[PDB]
C-alpha cells in the first residue's frame, strides 16, 4: 500500500527465471525481488532495539528526510534479530550486487509512503527526484584476506588495517560525447558494463555518412575514483605469516575521506579481474588480480581516543561540502554527558583516573599521573599574524631494566589514535622521515611517509633510546623544538607537520643505576639533550618485604581463573571522558598563576647554582610547568589555570626526578629516603 | 606440449523479441510450411 | 607433524596410554634428549620444559604476557653445547639454527623483494620469522653484532620486531623461543674475576633469560673415567651404553608433547601463598650476594614469572588441570641448581 517507481538497475536486473513458485528468481541466484522487498518493508516498518520500545528506523528515516541526508547506515547484525530477515541476512551476504539496489528502491518507496500517508507537506518532488543509498557496516567476522578462496569472489567482507598511500583523483567516464564532422550533429552515449558503443553512421536522415563520428574529450561526463593502499592487521595470524598491502577502490562521495596513518575498518566486496600483459597487445594473463571495493568505512572505536580535531579543521568543512556522511568523532548522549558531569563532580577524580589507566600494572602513581597528563595534553596557541605553540608533552623513562617501563608503551600505543612503536637501533634517518619508491602497479616513482609524519597528531613510542646513533638522533631536535621537518631531496623541497608527542625509554650504563654516581654518569646521553624533555622519570628498584609481598600477591592473583576478572572506570567511559575534555575545554592562565610561575622558575634556577652533576634548569622547564598546569586545569573541566594547578605541576616535576632524596652537592641518591 | 582449446554454448535466457526479417524465423516458417501445408486433405510435401 | 594439527584417536590413544602406564614420564623423557651425551641431566630437563612451554595468559584490556621460556647456556669450550643445540633444533617440529656472523642483517628479520609468479612486492622472513611458533637456536651468541643483539633483545621482550627503514615501516610477529649458547670472555672461566666481568653480554640481556646455565670443566679423575667409557663405547658401537633404560623415539616424543600442549592448568590459593613466601625469601637473599659483586643479577619480578611458567609447564607435563606444591618445589630446585658451579 504505497507508490512505486522502478529504478534503472532494477529494470536491468529484471530478466527473471522459472523454477521458483513466486516466479521472478534471478538466474544464477536464489533472490526473489517481491519477497525481498516485502520482507525489507516489514522489517523497516517494525523493529525495536530489543528507548528500546520506540520504532527504531521510523525515526531515523524521519530525521533523514528532515535534514536532507541520502545515506542510511545499516547494521547487518540487526537483521538476525527479526524473524523474517533470518534468510535475507544470508542473501545480502552472498548476493550484495542485486540486494543493495533492491533495498535502495525499497527505502525510496518507504520514504515516499511515509511523507504522503501523513499529509505533512506537498513538497515531495525533491525527494521523489533525489537518490538514496544504504551502507552495511557490521558484516560477520572474517578470517583475514589470506584465507579467502576463489569461490568467495563477489561476496561481502570486512577488513582492518592502516592507510599508507592514496592515488590522486582519477576521472572515470560515464557518458561519451560524439560529433559528426560534416553536419555538427552531436550525440551522447552511456557506458554499459565498461564498453562504449561508438556510432557507425550519423543518424540524421539528411546526413548518413559512414564513419563520421568523432569523440570530444572535454564534453563527456566523468565520475570520481580513487585507489587506497592499506596495511591490514588481521586478528588471527597463522605460523610464519608476514603482511602485505591491499588495494581498495573508493568511488563518488567516499573519495578523499581517508588520510595516511589512519586506523580504519572497511566493509566491501571481494573482486577479481585480469590484467593486460602489455600495452601494445591486447592479450591477458590467466592469473587474476584481486582487490576490494569499499562500500562502508568506520573511523571510530570505543577502545581508543578520538582524533584531535585541531589537526583536521579544514577536512571537516571539506566533508560538509562533499556531503559525505562519514563521522570523525563519536556521538555523545545526554545521559553520558550527565554522567561525565557527575563523575567530574567528585573529589577523588585525579587518583581515580590515575588508577584507572592500565589497571594491570601496580603502584607507579606518579608514572601513571604523568601518562594521564600527557594524554590530556596542553593548550595549543595560534598567533594571529603568524606563530605557533603546541601543548604536546615529551616524556622519557630511565630506571632498572626489569621494571614495568615497557608495558606502559604498549598500552599508550594501543589507546592512542595515531602512533608508531619503534626501537633505537632498528631505524634510520630516511626511514623516520620519508623516501621515494617505485609503485609496482603504475611503474612510477612516488613519495612515501615515515614514522614521524605518520604519527602526526598522536604519540610516538621509542624503545632503547640510548642505542640510537647520533645521525639518527639528529632529526629529533627540530621535531621536539618546532613540530616540523624540512626536506631538501631530489624532487621535493617542503616542510611537513609533525604534531606528535614523544614517549621514550632508556636503560642505564652497565647493570643497575648506581646511586653513588650522578645521573649524568648513569645515563648514556649528552647532558644537554636530557634538558629538552618535560619530565624525566627515575624508576628505581628497592628491596622491601612489604612491597614485595604486595606485588607478588597482585601478580599471582591473575592466574586464579582462566579469564581476567580484575573501583576502576571502564575503558570506554575513560576514553569518552578524555575525548570530551580534550575537545570541549580550553584553559587559560591568570596573574595569580603567573606570579607563582615566575617565583618557582627563579628558585629552580638559583638552587644548585662543580658541574655536569645535575640537569641544569632552562626555559624548557618553565614551558613544561606551563604545559603541565594547563593540562591539569583542562582535566576536571576547568577553564582557568590556578595556584593549585601550578603547585601540583611543580610538585610532579620535582617528584619525577626525586630531588627530595638527592644530595644537592654531590648529586647522589640516598636509598633510605626514597619511598616505594 | 598442450592440445587445442574448445568453445561451446547452451541456451538459458530469452533474447530480444524475434523480428520477422531474420534467417532463423524464415527457416522456422519454411519448416512449418513443409510440415503442415495440406491439399485435398493430404500432407503432400511430407509424404513425397 | 605440526602440533596444531593434533587430534585424539584410538591409534594415538593406545600409544600415549602405554607411555603414561610405563610411568616416570618426566625423567624418562628428559633422559631421551641426545642420549649419546653423558651426564648433563638438569640441562636436559630444562630443555624438555622449554619444549613443552608454559601457559599463555590474556589479562584483558589488550595487555598480554608471554607463555614461552628462554634458555641460555654459557660454558667452557668442549662440553657439547653445539651438540645439544643441534639435538633440540632437530627434535623441534619448527626448529631453526644459526651461528654468529653467518646470519646477519636481513638474514634475521625480513627483506623486501618482488614475487616472480605474481607482480606484487613481498617480505621474505629471516630465521626468526621462519622459526615462528618454534625454537630458534643461536650458537656463538656473544659474538653477534649490535643490531642482531637488539633484535633478539626486542624479540625476547615482546614477541614482535619493529622495522622502520627506507621503503618499510612495519612490525613482524615472532612467537618463538630462544635457546642460546655462549663462551666466557677470556675463553676458560676465570674464578679470580667476577661473573659479570667474565662475560661480554649486558647484564640486562642476561637477566631476561628465564634459565641461565653455567657449565664449567673442573678436572676430576673419577667422572673423567665415566665420560671416557661412555664416549669410547659410543664410538665402538653406534648406541648408548645403558641397558636398563630405553629411549623414546622422536615421533613418540612429539606425540606426547603435542597431546600435553592442549592442557591449561590453573593456580590455587595455597600454591599462591607458597610462591609469595618463596619469592620474598629469595629476593631478600639475593641482595647481599649481589652486593659482594658475586652474582649475575639481582632477583626481579621476571624471576617470579619464570617460576610460575616453569610450574605451569611441569603441571602440563603431568597432564593435570591444577598445579601442586611439588611442581613449584621442582622449579625452585632447578633455578637453584642453575648456578651451583659458582660455589665449588
Ligand atoms: N608494577 C608492576 N605491575 C605489574 N607487573 C609488573 C610490575 N613490575 C614488573 N612487572 C612484571 O615484570 C615484567 C616487566 O618487564 P618489562 O616491563 O618488559 O621490562 P622493562 O619495561 O623494564 O623493559 C612484566 O612481565 C610484568 O608482568
Ligand atoms: N659429555 C659429553 N659426552 C660425549 N661427548 C662430549 C661431551 N662433552 C663434549 N663432547 C664432545 O666434544 C665436542 C664438543 O664440541 P661442540 O659440540 O662444538 O661443543 P663446544 O662448542 O662447547 O666445544 C663434541 O664433538 C662432543 O662429541
Ligand atoms: Mg620491557
Ligand atoms: Mg660450539
Ligand atoms: Zn552527420
XYZ file of C-alpha atoms in Angstrom, chain C:
344
model
C 53.790 -33.297 12.208
C 52.822 -29.851 13.456
C 51.337 -29.610 16.936
C 48.377 -27.521 15.763
C 47.033 -30.422 13.677
C 46.809 -32.747 16.693
C 43.719 -34.932 17.021
C 42.952 -37.631 19.575
C 42.146 -41.121 18.306
C 42.463 -44.779 19.268
C 45.788 -45.115 17.444
C 47.365 -42.209 19.334
C 45.371 -43.081 22.452
C 46.869 -46.535 22.958
C 50.442 -45.335 22.412
C 50.030 -42.419 24.820
C 48.263 -44.575 27.408
C 51.095 -47.102 27.227
C 53.621 -44.303 27.717
C 51.921 -42.965 30.859
C 51.343 -46.508 32.135
C 55.105 -47.008 31.927
C 55.421 -44.173 34.445
C 58.246 -41.800 35.358
C 57.379 -39.676 32.325
C 59.380 -36.632 33.430
C 62.783 -38.283 33.825
C 62.130 -40.822 31.064
C 61.587 -38.035 28.528
C 64.395 -35.889 29.946
C 66.961 -38.686 29.586
C 65.919 -39.248 25.949
C 67.214 -35.929 24.551
C 70.526 -36.685 22.829
C 71.188 -39.930 24.750
C 74.748 -40.064 23.364
C 75.908 -37.180 25.606
C 76.956 -38.278 29.088
C 75.780 -36.514 32.219
C 74.036 -33.159 31.956
C 70.650 -34.148 33.378
C 69.333 -30.828 34.694
C 70.080 -29.014 31.432
C 68.179 -31.762 29.617
C 65.225 -31.336 31.979
C 65.275 -27.580 31.368
C 65.359 -28.178 27.611
C 62.366 -30.517 27.842
C 60.461 -27.888 29.820
C 61.416 -25.333 27.167
C 59.978 -27.654 24.525
C 56.722 -28.090 26.444
C 56.339 -24.383 27.215
C 54.227 -22.507 29.722
C 50.664 -21.194 29.651
C 49.814 -18.052 27.710
C 47.503 -15.630 29.515
C 45.283 -12.844 28.182
C 44.860 -10.395 31.061
C 42.299 -8.172 29.304
C 42.294 -4.551 28.181
C 44.537 -5.605 25.290
C 47.508 -6.388 27.529
C 49.445 -9.597 27.005
C 52.047 -11.717 28.800
C 54.144 -14.422 27.176
C 53.979 -18.144 27.850
C 57.280 -19.181 26.276
C 60.557 -19.898 28.074
C 64.054 -18.686 27.164
C 67.254 -20.612 27.879
C 70.915 -19.610 27.713
C 73.859 -21.959 28.186
C 77.232 -20.384 28.953
C 80.233 -22.589 29.421
C 83.812 -23.641 28.912
C 84.898 -24.865 25.467
C 84.363 -28.514 24.633
C 81.209 -29.527 26.514
C 78.868 -30.404 23.605
C 76.813 -27.199 23.683
C 76.599 -27.290 19.888
C 75.572 -30.950 20.039
C 72.691 -30.122 22.379
C 71.665 -27.165 20.203
C 71.556 -29.442 17.150
C 69.594 -32.091 19.045
C 66.927 -29.624 20.179
C 66.661 -27.963 16.767
C 66.137 -31.395 15.211
C 63.587 -32.587 17.782
C 61.527 -29.425 17.374
C 58.957 -29.539 14.537
C 59.719 -25.921 13.527
C 63.234 -25.528 14.887
C 65.772 -23.238 13.238
C 69.536 -22.994 13.750
C 72.042 -20.154 13.349
C 75.661 -19.341 14.240
C 77.204 -15.952 14.874
C 78.170 -13.839 11.882
C 76.935 -16.455 9.407
C 73.442 -14.932 9.636
C 73.243 -11.150 9.951
C 71.073 -8.235 8.920
C 68.252 -9.352 6.646
C 69.314 -12.899 7.463
C 67.318 -12.122 10.572
C 64.086 -10.113 10.313
C 62.946 -9.811 6.662
C 63.814 -8.224 3.320
C 61.704 -6.608 0.597
C 61.585 -8.274 -2.818
C 59.324 -8.800 -5.827
C 57.467 -12.052 -6.404
C 58.153 -13.670 -9.805
C 54.864 -15.561 -10.071
C 52.608 -12.630 -9.214
C 53.541 -8.975 -9.722
C 53.336 -7.770 -6.105
C 56.044 -6.915 -3.591
C 56.570 -9.217 -0.608
C 58.682 -9.583 2.533
C 60.871 -12.667 2.918
C 61.432 -13.534 6.557
C 64.701 -14.460 8.214
C 65.492 -17.139 10.759
C 63.319 -15.514 13.428
C 60.197 -15.347 11.252
C 60.922 -18.792 9.780
C 61.047 -20.226 13.321
C 57.736 -18.671 14.396
C 55.883 -20.845 16.913
C 59.120 -22.790 17.311
C 62.628 -22.805 18.795
C 65.487 -20.676 17.460
C 68.976 -21.951 18.293
C 71.801 -19.397 18.332
C 75.380 -20.635 18.645
C 78.237 -18.250 19.410
C 75.747 -15.820 20.917
C 78.352 -13.482 22.424
C 79.973 -12.797 19.036
C 76.881 -11.269 17.417
C 76.584 -7.684 16.195
C 74.753 -4.868 17.972
C 71.794 -4.793 15.574
C 71.198 -8.538 15.874
C 71.564 -8.344 19.650
C 68.939 -5.586 19.724
C 66.614 -7.651 17.531
C 66.920 -10.642 19.877
C 66.518 -8.214 22.785
C 63.156 -6.989 21.499
C 62.004 -10.462 20.417
C 62.584 -11.890 23.886
C 60.870 -8.773 25.229
C 57.530 -8.915 23.425
C 57.477 -11.428 20.528
C 57.388 -8.652 17.922
C 60.005 -6.991 15.720
C 59.629 -3.354 14.671
C 61.305 -2.162 11.464
C 61.402 1.433 10.188
C 63.763 1.739 7.213
C 63.642 3.133 3.688
C 60.665 1.563 1.948
C 59.362 -0.307 5.006
C 57.574 0.643 8.241
C 56.018 -2.385 9.906
C 56.007 -4.925 12.726
C 56.524 -8.682 12.408
C 55.249 -11.439 14.695
C 57.947 -13.654 16.236
C 56.141 -16.047 18.594
C 59.338 -18.041 19.080
C 61.511 -19.327 21.916
C 65.250 -18.669 22.205
C 67.986 -21.186 23.028
C 71.397 -19.505 23.080
C 74.979 -20.667 23.619
C 77.925 -18.592 24.823
C 81.550 -18.795 25.972
C 83.410 -16.751 28.610
C 85.247 -13.613 27.557
C 88.788 -14.984 28.056
C 87.996 -18.499 26.857
C 88.028 -20.534 30.045
C 86.267 -19.112 33.083
C 88.464 -17.145 35.494
C 87.327 -17.673 39.120
C 89.512 -14.754 40.265
C 87.215 -12.417 38.291
C 83.574 -11.558 38.834
C 80.912 -13.367 36.772
C 79.817 -10.135 35.079
C 83.414 -9.382 34.051
C 83.789 -12.970 32.807
C 81.238 -12.336 30.014
C 80.730 -9.736 27.289
C 76.928 -9.624 27.095
C 74.980 -6.994 29.077
C 73.575 -7.898 32.472
C 70.037 -6.879 31.455
C 70.148 -9.227 28.467
C 71.431 -11.992 30.732
C 68.621 -11.261 33.195
C 65.863 -11.511 30.602
C 66.607 -15.243 30.168
C 64.277 -17.483 32.151
C 67.042 -20.065 32.650
C 70.783 -19.350 32.540
C 73.012 -22.403 32.930
C 76.722 -22.160 33.708
C 78.875 -25.107 32.614
C 82.487 -25.369 33.775
C 85.156 -28.034 33.281
C 86.835 -28.862 36.597
C 89.061 -31.941 36.120
C 88.078 -34.972 38.184
C 89.821 -38.327 37.857
C 86.630 -40.195 38.790
C 83.986 -38.723 36.478
C 86.528 -38.405 33.661
C 86.708 -42.207 33.626
C 82.932 -42.469 33.244
C 82.890 -39.882 30.455
C 85.713 -41.650 28.613
C 83.977 -45.022 28.898
C 80.729 -43.524 27.615
C 82.276 -41.759 24.621
C 84.526 -44.649 23.612
C 81.635 -47.120 23.883
C 79.517 -44.819 21.715
C 82.256 -44.805 19.083
C 82.868 -48.562 19.223
C 79.134 -49.214 18.829
C 76.535 -46.825 17.418
C 74.373 -46.855 20.568
C 74.332 -45.528 24.104
C 75.800 -47.895 26.715
C 72.992 -48.161 29.257
C 70.747 -51.223 29.075
C 68.284 -50.692 31.944
C 66.893 -47.612 30.144
C 65.219 -47.495 26.731
C 64.966 -44.142 24.903
C 61.708 -42.975 23.363
C 61.828 -42.081 19.692
C 61.263 -38.521 18.431
C 57.899 -39.456 16.919
C 56.534 -40.578 20.289
C 58.128 -37.577 21.997
C 56.376 -35.221 19.576
C 53.113 -37.119 20.031
C 53.175 -36.769 23.815
C 54.289 -33.130 23.711
C 51.501 -32.274 21.264
C 48.949 -34.010 23.478
C 50.225 -32.180 26.565
C 50.157 -28.782 24.838
C 46.337 -28.996 24.857
C 46.127 -28.541 28.647
C 45.853 -25.274 30.590
C 46.323 -25.795 34.337
C 45.356 -23.104 36.835
C 46.766 -21.615 40.035
C 45.316 -22.135 43.514
C 45.489 -20.103 46.737
C 47.765 -22.448 48.706
C 50.322 -22.544 45.893
C 49.986 -18.770 45.551
C 50.850 -18.387 49.241
C 53.818 -20.725 48.860
C 55.072 -18.808 45.817
C 54.788 -15.410 47.504
C 56.704 -16.667 50.547
C 59.414 -18.216 48.372
C 59.735 -15.073 46.252
C 60.049 -12.841 49.311
C 62.750 -15.074 50.783
C 64.696 -15.311 47.517
C 64.515 -11.577 46.805
C 65.674 -10.772 50.332
C 68.564 -13.221 49.972
C 69.859 -12.162 46.553
C 70.616 -8.579 47.612
C 73.578 -9.418 49.850
C 75.060 -11.713 47.201
C 74.826 -9.014 44.537
C 76.469 -6.524 46.912
C 79.655 -8.628 47.073
C 79.925 -8.453 43.251
C 79.325 -12.217 43.119
C 76.055 -12.579 41.209
C 74.956 -12.449 37.583
C 71.974 -10.321 38.605
C 69.606 -9.285 41.372
C 66.320 -11.155 41.638
C 63.421 -9.373 39.943
C 59.737 -9.958 39.069
C 60.889 -11.707 35.899
C 62.242 -14.406 38.222
C 58.802 -14.873 39.781
C 57.223 -15.015 36.329
C 59.757 -17.642 35.281
C 58.975 -19.718 38.367
C 55.265 -19.523 37.561
C 55.856 -20.542 33.944
C 58.059 -23.482 34.945
C 55.461 -24.719 37.432
C 52.792 -24.473 34.733
C 54.980 -26.433 32.316
C 55.554 -29.166 34.898
C 51.808 -29.384 35.524
C 51.112 -29.619 31.790
C 53.652 -32.431 31.513
C 51.926 -34.192 34.406
C 48.712 -33.770 32.361
C 46.625 -32.211 35.122
C 44.205 -29.299 35.345
C 45.736 -27.890 38.552
C 49.221 -27.249 39.897
C 50.660 -28.650 43.126
C 53.326 -27.622 45.616
C 55.724 -30.258 44.265
C 55.836 -28.509 40.881
C 56.921 -25.228 42.477
C 59.406 -27.183 44.587
C 60.959 -28.650 41.441
C 61.016 -25.261 39.703
C 62.912 -23.714 42.616
C 65.156 -26.794 42.695
C 66.132 -26.200 39.061
C 66.594 -22.450 39.489
C 68.883 -23.155 42.447
C 70.932 -25.761 40.567
C 71.380 -23.373 37.667
C 74.302 -21.649 39.462
C 75.832 -24.440 41.577
C 79.061 -24.298 39.540
C 79.971 -20.905 41.048
C 80.329 -22.422 44.545
C 82.985 -25.128 44.093
